[PDB]
Amino acid sequence: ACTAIDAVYTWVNGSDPNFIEDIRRFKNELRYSLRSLEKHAAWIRHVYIVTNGQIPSWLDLSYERVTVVPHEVLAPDPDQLPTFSSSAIETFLHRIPKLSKRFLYLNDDIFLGAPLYPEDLYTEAEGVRVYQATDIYSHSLIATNMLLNRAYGFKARHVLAHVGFLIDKDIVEAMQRRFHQQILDTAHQRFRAPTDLQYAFAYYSFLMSETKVMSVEEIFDEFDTDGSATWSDREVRTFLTRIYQPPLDWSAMRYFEEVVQNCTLPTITRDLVVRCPLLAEALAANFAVRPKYNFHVSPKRTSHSNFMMLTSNLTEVVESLDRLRRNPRKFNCINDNLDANRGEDNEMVRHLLEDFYLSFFPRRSKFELPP
Amino acid sequence: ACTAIDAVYTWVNGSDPNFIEDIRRFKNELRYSLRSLEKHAAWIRHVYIVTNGQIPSWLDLSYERVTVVPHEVLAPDPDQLPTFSSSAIETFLHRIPKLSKRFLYLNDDIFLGAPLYPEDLYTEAEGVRVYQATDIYSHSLIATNMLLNRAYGFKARHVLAHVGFLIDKDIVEAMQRRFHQQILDTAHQRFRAPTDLQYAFAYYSFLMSETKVMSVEEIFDEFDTDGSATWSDREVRTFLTRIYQPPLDWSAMRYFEEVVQNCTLPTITRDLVVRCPLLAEALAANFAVRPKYNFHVSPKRTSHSNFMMLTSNLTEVVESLDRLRRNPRKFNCINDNLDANRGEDNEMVRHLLEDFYLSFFPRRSKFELPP
Ligand SMILES: [Ca+2]
Ligand SMILES: [Ca+2]
Numbered sequence: 224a225c226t227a228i229d230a231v232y233t234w235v236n237g238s239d240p241n242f243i244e245d246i247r248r249f250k251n252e253l254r255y256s257l258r259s260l261e262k263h264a265a266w267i268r269h270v271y272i273v274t275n276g277q278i279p280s281w282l283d284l285s286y287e288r289v290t291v292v293p294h295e296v297l298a299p300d301p302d303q304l305p306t307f308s309s310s311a312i313e314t315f316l317h318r319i320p321k322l323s324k325r326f327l328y329l330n331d332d333i334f335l336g337a338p339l340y341p342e343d344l345y346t347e348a349e350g351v352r353v354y355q356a357t358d359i360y361s362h363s364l365i366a367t368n369m370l371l372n373r374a375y376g377f378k379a380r381h382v383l384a385h386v387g388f389l390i391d392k393d394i395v396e397a398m399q400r401r402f403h404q405q406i407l408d409t410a411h412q413r414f415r416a417p418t419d420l421q422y423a424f425a426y427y428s429f430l431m432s433e434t435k436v437m438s439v440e441e442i443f444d445e446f447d448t449d450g451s452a453t454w455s456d457r458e459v460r461t462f463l464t465r466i467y468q469p470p471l472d473w474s475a476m477r478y479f480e481e482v483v484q485n486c487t488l489p490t491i492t493r494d495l496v497v498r499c500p501l502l503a504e505a506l507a508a509n510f511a512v513r514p515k516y517n518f519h520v521s522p523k524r525t526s527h528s529n530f531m532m533l534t535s536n537l538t539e540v541v542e543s544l545d546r547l548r549r550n551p552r553k554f555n556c557i558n559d560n561l562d563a564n565r566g567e568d569n570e571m572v573r574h575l576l577e578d579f580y581l582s583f584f585p586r587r588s589k590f591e592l593p594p
Numbered sequence: 595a596c597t598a599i600d601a602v603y604t605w606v607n608g609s610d611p612n613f614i615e616d617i618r619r620f621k622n623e624l625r626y627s628l629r630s631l632e633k634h635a636a637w638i639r640h641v642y643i644v645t646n647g648q649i650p651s652w653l654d655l656s657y658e659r660v661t662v663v664p665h666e667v668l669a670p671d672p673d674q675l676p677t678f679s680s681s682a683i684e685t686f687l688h689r690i691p692k693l694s695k696r697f698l699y700l701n702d703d704i705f706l707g708a709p710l711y712p713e714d715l716y717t718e719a720e721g722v723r724v725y726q727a728t729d730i731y732s733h734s735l736i737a738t739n740m741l742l743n744r745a746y747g748f749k750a751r752h753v754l755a756h757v758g759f760l761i762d763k764d765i766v767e768a769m770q771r772r773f774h775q776q777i778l779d780t781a782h783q784r785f786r787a788p789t790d791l792q793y794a795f796a797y798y799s800f801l802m803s804e805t806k807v808m809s810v811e812e813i814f815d816e817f818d819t820d821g822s823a824t825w826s827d828r829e830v831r832t833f834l835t836r837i838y839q840p841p842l843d844w845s846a847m848r849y850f851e852e853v854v855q856n857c858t859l860p861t862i863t864r865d866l867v868v869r870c871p872l873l874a875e876a877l878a879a880n881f882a883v884r885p886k887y888n889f890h891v892s893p894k895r896t897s898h899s900n901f902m903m904l905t906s907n908l909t910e911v912v913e914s915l916d917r918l919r920r921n922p923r924k925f926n927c928i929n930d931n932l933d934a935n936r937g938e939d940n941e942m943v944r945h946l947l948e949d950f951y952l953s954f955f956p957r958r959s960k961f962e963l964p965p
Contacts, residue, residue, distance in 0.1 A: 457953035464919040548835040582828035
């Protein structure tokens, strides 16, 4: 337990009258997913749930590891807060007061076997493991991809893979200060509309393409190994080897001494290499395009993250739930995509899924009050 | 700083009369390599040096981070201790009293740029990064490879790559209790003889091939997710999916119930699956060959570990020392292989190398007393 994590959760409930009244104005998942944290990741040290005031019935409060914070305290400009979309709620997840610097996102339907360690998400050498992989979701995909395609170059950017995302508070604040038009746009919306900015992809493509700029006075402060303001011949040879690569030659030596002698080896200082052109330009052309935040593409080896959608064909349900059992990987994500016309098959489906979730996680975790 | 490391060093000195007297009876490297620890790895929290009683002249003692321990206190059977080989000294490196569980080996000529983090060596999910890559050294290579080829299978085993090796005390004690013939053989030797067992390769091939055995009572204690001694139909289906893979079929269901019914689904317990043959054999044939220690082959991306031998051709010296400067990688290892006939070129070589080692590490570190 080197660093705190403090994962978050959402849990919208669409069964009580006070939610469907506000909808009219305009599957017990988390119980078995917060239960997975007690088994396979016992280091997260706090759990938040962001709701609209409504608590779950089975939360044992005063556990000092689980709290609920509503949208009344989070959202700026308290005029948008009657909100019923995920992506609007995602835009104020970093305004939780005693939040640690980094945190797991994992939303509601993320249960996890195959125990989780903090080095699976954030190391210190590397440190953000970016897990690469139609009606309403595709349009927001195209809009976010085009918005990140206006700036930041072009390249190919891959979508993510349904893991619990690890999110830094400072990087997302610099994200929201970069796209202040679209953050307020998606914030001031009621439902899921096709001009949205999805938070995870616009985070993990923002972080992958922030390029820092280092000034010439900072390449003098580093890149000599010395005490103060000395640039001697050892540092000169270190400087010349990082430019003219294949061998190093006498031509580069007399080129460098010709450049220093034209400044009208006599004690190369900081003020000379800041002042003199055609060397500071030739120095900053090599070392100024360093990336801003530490990132790490995953080598697709350990957490292959079984997605495995839950359609209403009971055959495909039973090979899907058995194929979640043949491979007990790190993250698993069962989203519904359920029919509403078949009220007879989608009762046996919800009873069949209960056989799956009790097959792995049958103990009453300490988050749940005794019935 | 999650865990302690406490690296070790050797530093044999072949210049004083009291060493050459004992040799007759039968390059300032570490100063610039212990100096690299103050710059690029400030978490190792103790440094040991194992000698034969002789201290360096420039060690500032009472630093409470650097100590010297001689061979008198380490070696069992105090009859072997007049020793003048590396590999004999390597066989009692884990008898240092206040040693942590894991430790860096790095011997004497290992200086390191490009800062080192504990996740570069030992994580918790993985945790031993095994860095794969003629007169006297080749024979010990063939002997150690054949000794590890007698047991442990056959396969291909690769040599290591001159990094600071991370070594566990318990794994090396189980190594020395496996090869008690060769440990005492190489311990009771005076010099480097061609029947040696090299410590790093016989460690990192021992650790890669210890296979554990799990009893059938332990595959009942795990592999049900339950409280105590219950093996119900959810666990049965989890059990059957991990054997008959492609789909799961009704034939496997009636096969399993036929196996349980022939034990002369009626409450499958622990005593039944321990007692009944042709199921416990069929259960342990799948889950008993799990490896003993966590290991991790390195993907050869970050620490490519410039070796770059130091022969006496001054041209090859200057492209070697410049090519150490073009690539500032994680570990670097300059071993001598120096001629002794040319006393005139091998003075300019040692002065030229001093230009290299002061080009990166010029500050007097806190390990060194002021001259
Ligand atoms: Ca300098
Ligand atoms: Ca059970």
